[PDB]
From a paper:
To visualise how [name] interacts with the [name]:[name] dimer we used cryo-electron microscopy to determine the structure of [name] bound to the [name](ELM2-SANT):[name] complex. A map was calculated using 70 561 particles to a resolution of 6.1 Å. The dimeric nature of the complex was immediately apparent in the raw micrographs with front-on particles resembling ‘bowties’ (i.e. two HDACs flanking the [name] dimer interface). On fitting the [name]:[name] dimer structure into the map, it was apparent that the complex was asymmetric with additional density appearing on one but not both of the [name]-SANT domains. Having placed the two crystal structures into the map, the remaining unaccounted-for density was extracted and examined. Particularly interesting was density from the intrinsically disordered domain (IDR) of [name], and the CC domain, which appears to wrap around both sides of the dimerisation interface. On inspection of the [name] sequence we identified a short hydrophobic motif (I/VTxQI/V) that is repeated twice in [name] with a linker of 36 amino-acids. Binding of the two motifs across the [name] dimer interface would explain why one bound [name] would occlude binding of a second [name]. The 3D map was high enough resolution to model a single MBD domain ([name] residues 145–220) in close proximity to one of the [name]-SANT domains. [name] appears to wrap around the dimerisation interface of [name], binding to both front and back surfaces, possibly through a repeated motif.
Numbering used by the authors:
A (entry chain A), D (entry chain D): 165 to 228, 237 to 340
B (entry chain B), E (entry chain E): 8 to 376
C (entry chain C): 149 to 212
Write the structure that this text describes.
């Protein structure tokens, strides 16, 4: 509980650039844009596109439970993918819709929740109830073919499960 | 109406600190997702931050502290234990898979945004991953490994003479303080619990040193502070601060463990009160860089920063939480706001006015006309 | 048996779910030394290690 | 078996119009166009739109069986409606898609096959097996609230029914 | 490549002639639907025909025959029976609900298209509902109530000096013949079964009358005619016809009861052979108006006119039938084409060449240089 002074504590203060000097920072190495906020589109059209992105998704998973598939297709991953599809296609609705149905065939986005097999899901509920929330061991011993970070993403999504009732 | 830039990398919610550990990065993903469903995402410029390399992390940190972080794993955990103790990595700062990846994203978000502010192509920039303010030059501390805040500020100094740093987090922002303890170009103001609490620093008499004396403001506090008490001591002090320190870029750390019913915190603030600070700051129309920080009742962390994002867009959102992947997380109520608890506010008017006055004196010592 | 990175090299932690009775479904946490000696509580582990580690802030249940 | 001659058999032959004379025929009273063949659109885009029109339809009937709803939405009525939606919106993909999701809500097209209630369908199979293909009496006595021409349209659609096996 | 206009009203498939009756309007809806799924619909100009009013139906028919039709119903069926017998409405031409609506659509399609041809804004125009060629001025006959063909032709005469009418239907096109029996401006050529068959007219010696003599061509035929025999007698005769009668607009009635395995017909033609006629006509690059007509094995009627529509667009289609609402109608095979039966062709080469020559003489009687 003490604040220290010295070369090994304080930061070297970065000098203000001259009016002629330039910071020399490549912005593409630092960021890559995912949604412009000033679009030729209106809320209605974006909203509409989101409905469409959802419908494709449901029709996609109909081609290899109705309400279930629709809810599945209504999850955030599909929406996020819908907002990128717009931006990648320069907010051209007509161009963006092609992206969603590339060659007459729809696209499927499934989060780790939906994507895991019945038996993987099963494995997870055994590994949790047995190792608690120790997710490296849960993989090592129960789901070693999955990547840790996919098991995390799954965990949190699974915590909202319906059949999941830890509370009373 | 101010233009806002939001930084987020999908991976950040998936990094995990360890079983039984309170810091849970997933809370940022929860926020992200609410923002999309509250329709706010739509309304701001969304950037994926590239990974910050050791190159720019060593612009403040040790060439061999970052080296250590780049290298350490849970594999070679028993091989390094020598260096582990010298760098504070353990009891409450675990090693964990992806750790260095996590730091790169948190730091990348803050730095990219700072540039964005310097390049004068935004008014506000938001990175909820960032804000990790306990980190030191040569050691990790309080769940913080890299101090993205300092690095962010260091870039801003390239275009801004005076950078103000405000810290709402319940814990004293000693990392950002210590890093700038001897400079007059950056003023670090912090409101926090004090007395049998971490990090043990930031009492009334912590004023700075050298050129940095009278440039480190602190407000020590006891338990149970209201929105009403907090508001009544934040606005006066910050208006003086602006009055005296006259900054040209603000960095507001919006720590959410100062909210009511936090797991680690013991303050009695509501999202509303907490946000009133962000709104007050924003009102001073300076290039602003909102970061997150602490927060350990993640349902409310989510709520808070979602709300405070709206504030930066000065758009209204309903108390009705929109459906989302984690909708079921939010109690029986599924509302945005929280109300304060019956918890007793041990910050009597007498105690707050004593401190206030002492600070008003400290601030008067600065130059003015 | 999982490596516990915050303890010295070779130390491991295991969590075991109770299968029946009063606390069916709850778990117990155990640690193992490098030689395989089993420990069942924080004070037992702290007594064994002594001053070679500071366990004040060590969360026995999570191993962090 | 005889061909007749006279004023009461032959047609009065319509005289060729002068180079100055005009036929005087209002074309809007005679026809109304439903699809232009020279569109700014390509086969791919129309095809794509048709997939989209189908997806909406499936997602529509998910909002009050997956494969069943998709097939239902893939029937011709939905497609025809998709080709009109295009033409009405001047072959603007982006405008036409709004038409399909007017206010964030999708549109449902159901032919008489799909539209009839379980009990109406039932009535029909009793009326047929009892009155054969006498569709005015089938209505009068069994489905009097339906219009004859809807019962016809239903009939033909029902003849392809799966559960329908009159052949061996 | 020629431009095609297609006329269709959705209601037309839903009108019904009566229990046990062979004429089934639904076959047009089946065609329509195949056209959409074969992708042909896409490629031609699609028009809904407004209802033809008594105004233009009386341009050929009796003011009191149409009046009768406009009025008659199954309600007042026992009240009218007087007029029913004078007008032929009964045994094989039933009264039925919507009858007059049905006529209006069939006639509207043909007339609208004729105009379209006169207005020179199409090359080909198609109306499968139309073609109802047994109708007379003052009476219904052979399932035909209004002779859309005559009315169509009457409009064409407004811009075309010479209108050729070709009739493939197995039944002799006596309605269109009788209506134009005394004029030289319209030549009616017809290939049909003859001898114990309807309508009893159109033998070798049926040549016309007055100004219309040597302008009504007929080819009488016995059972079992091949594609090969038919082709070998259609092309020669039609090339002479064009040669001599030199028309400026063609109207081809594409009756599909001349196909093999028809319910009423007894010819042995395949879709391929049948269409070869449409293709041959089209080749003479004249404004062309394709109508349908008879056809009573509707699965094949559908196939035929679908194929023959492709021919007008000179686009290829696969033998694989595309899925459609009535897909299950098409046998175990689900193919477009039909093959001929073992049925015996009683049209010996000697018998066809006798007739051919007689017709070549008749046609030579026309003026030429
Ligand atoms: O999944 P984790 O990240 O380990 O967090 C969980 C989780 O807390 P959050 O929902 O805020 O993440 C549990 O909450 P529920 O799943 O029950 O909603 C909570 O249980 P309580 O809220 O009932 O305390 C539990 O805490 P505990 O382990 O004490 O039961 C806690 O795990 P940690 O305590 O390890 O963070
Ligand atoms: O439904 P309708 O318009 O009355 O026609 C049907 C139908 O013929 P289409 O399918 O060509 O319309 C039947 O065919 P399926 O339903 O069996 O496929 C046919 O039966 P067959 O093909 O087995 O002859 C039957 O004829 P019938 O009544 O002699 O059984 C015939 O009814 P109509 O003879 O009244 O036209
Ligand atoms: K603070
Ligand atoms: K300072
Ligand atoms: K004929
Ligand atoms: K004639
Ligand atoms: Zn804190
Ligand atoms: Zn016929």
């Amino acid at each position: 509980g003490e604040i220290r002074v010295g070369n090994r504590y304080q930061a070297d203060i970065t000098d203000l650039l001259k009016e002629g000097e330039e910071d020399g920072r490549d912005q593409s190495r630092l960021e890559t844009q995912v949604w412009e906020a000033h679009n030729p589109l209106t809320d209605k059209q974006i909203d509409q596109f989101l409905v469409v992105a959802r419908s494709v998704g449901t029709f996609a998973r109909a081609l290899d439970s109705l309400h279930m598939s629709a809810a599945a297709a209504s999850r955030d991953i599909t929406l996020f993918h819908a907002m990128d599809t717009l931006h990648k296609n320069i907010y051209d609705i007509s161009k963006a819709i092609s992206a969603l149905v590339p060659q007459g065939g729809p696209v499927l986005c499934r989060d780790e929740m939906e994507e895991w097999s019945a038996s993987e899901a099963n494995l997870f509920e055994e590994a949790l109830e047995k190792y608690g929330k120790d997710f490296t061991d849960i993989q090592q011993d129960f789901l070693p073919w999955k990547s840790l970070t996919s098991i995390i993403e799954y965990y949190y999504m699974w915590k909202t499960t319906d059949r999941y009732v830890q509370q009373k | 109406r101010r233009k806002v830039c939001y930084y987020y990398d999908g991976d950040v919610g998936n990094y995990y600190y360890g079983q039984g550990h309170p810091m849970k990065p997933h809370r940022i993903r929860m926020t992200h997702n609410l923002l999309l469903n509250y329709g706010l995402y739509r309304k701001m410029e969304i950037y994926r931050p590239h990974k910050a390399n050791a190159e720019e992390m060593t612009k403040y940190h040790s060439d061999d502290y970052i080296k250590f972080l780049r290298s350490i794993r849970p594999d070679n955990m028993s091989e390094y234990s020598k260096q582990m103790q010298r760098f504070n990595v353990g009891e409450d700062c675990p090693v964990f898979d992806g750790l260095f990846e996590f730091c790169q994203l948190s730091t990348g978000g803050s730095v990219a945004s700072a540039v964005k502010l310097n390049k004068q192509q935004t008014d506000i920039a938001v990175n909820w991953a960032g804000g990790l303010h306990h980190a030191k030059k040569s050691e990790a501390s309080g769940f913080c490994y890299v101090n993205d805040i300092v690095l962010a500020i260091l870039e801003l100094l390239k275009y801004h003479q005076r950078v103000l740093y405000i810290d709402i987090d319940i814990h004293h922002g000693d990392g950002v303080e210590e890093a700038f303890y001897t400079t007059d170009r950056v003023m670090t103001v912090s409101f926090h619990k004090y007395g049998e609490y971490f990090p043990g620093t930031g009492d009334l008499r912590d004023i700075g040193a050298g050129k940095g004396k009278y440039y480190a403001v602190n407000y020590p506090l006891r338990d149970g502070i209201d929105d009403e008490s907090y508001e009544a001591i934040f606005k006066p002090v910050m208006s003086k601060v602006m009055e005296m320190f006259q900054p040209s870029a603000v960095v507001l750390q919006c720590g959410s463990d100062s909210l009511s019913g936090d797991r680690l915190g013991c303050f009695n603030l509501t999202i509303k009160g907490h946000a009133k600070c962000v709104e007050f700051v924003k009102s001073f129309n300076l290039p602003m860089l909102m970061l997150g920080g602490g927060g350990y009742t993640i349902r409310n962390v989510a709520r808070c920063w979602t709300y405070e994002t709206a504030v930066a867009l000065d758009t209204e959102i309903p108390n009705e939480l929109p459906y989302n992947d984690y909708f079921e997380y939010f109690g029986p109520d599924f509302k945005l706001h929280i109300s304060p608890s019956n918890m007793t506010n041990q910050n009597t008017n007498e105690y707050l006015e004593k401190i206030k006055q002492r600070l008003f004196e400290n601030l008067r010592m600065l130059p003015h006309a | 048996r999982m490596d516990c990175p915050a303890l010295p090299p070779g130390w491991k932690k295991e969590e075991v779910i109770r299968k029946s009775g009063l606390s069916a479904g709850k778990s117990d946490v155990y640690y193992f030394s490098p030689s395989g000696k089993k420990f069942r509580s924080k004070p037992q582990l702290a007594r064994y290690l002594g001053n070679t580690v500071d366990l004040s802030s060590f969360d026995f249940r999570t191993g962090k």
